[PDB]
């Protein structure tokens, strides 16, 4: 019959999503693997 | 200045030579200090070691060619070269810390050595 009906909802769907995080992405390690010479097998360094 | 090398020169085909470094103050010496040499075109190798356990074990290659002691009245440490030929040519340094790879050790002047 005549009269306004309501059918379903539509919804304006999300398009690229994106990611933001912040600067001073980073300490040296390669002070660790760049060091000139490595030192003996019972004198394991645990550069922290 | 609160280390120094004395002795050392030049060097006569089989004659004897004395040589030396020092420390500053006892704790310094703790626990490891060990001879070190280096060498224009030959590869730096360390010389004699005194590892603080009491027990003394110089390197297989080279533990039959220098005596090593230790006077900390001067803090001295004395040092002998003996029977030099023209294929070693080193140049002497006096750095801590070489069983530590290339992050521990001590690097300050030292001295120049040319062994013709």
């Known amino acids: 019959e005549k009269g306004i009906y309501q059918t379903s909802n539509f919804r304006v769907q999300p398009t690229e999503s994106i990611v933001r995080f912040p600067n001073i992405t980073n300490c040296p390690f390669g002070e660790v693997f760049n060091a000139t010479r490595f030192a003996s097998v019972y004198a394991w360094n645990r550069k922290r | 200045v609160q280390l120094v090398e004395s002795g050392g020169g030049l060097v006569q085909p089989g004659g004897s030579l004395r040589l030396s470094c020092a420390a500053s103050?006892?704790?310094?010496?703790?626990?490891?200090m060990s001879w070190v040499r280096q060498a224009p075109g030959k590869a730096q190798e360390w010389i004699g070691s005194?590892?603080?356990?009491?027990?003394?074990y110089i390197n297989p290659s080279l533990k039959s060619l220098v005596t090593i002691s230790r006077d900390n009245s001067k803090n001295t440490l004395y040092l002998q070269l003996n029977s030099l030929r023209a294929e070693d040519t080193a140049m002497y340094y006096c750095?801590?810390?070489?069983?530590?790879?290339?992050?521990?050790?001590?690097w300050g002047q030292g001295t120049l050595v040319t062994v013709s």
């Open positions: 103050d006892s704790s310094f010496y703790d626990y490891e």
């Open positions: 750095v801590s810390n070489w069983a530590s790879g290339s992050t521990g050790d001590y």
């Open positions: 005194m590892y603080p356990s009491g027990r003394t």
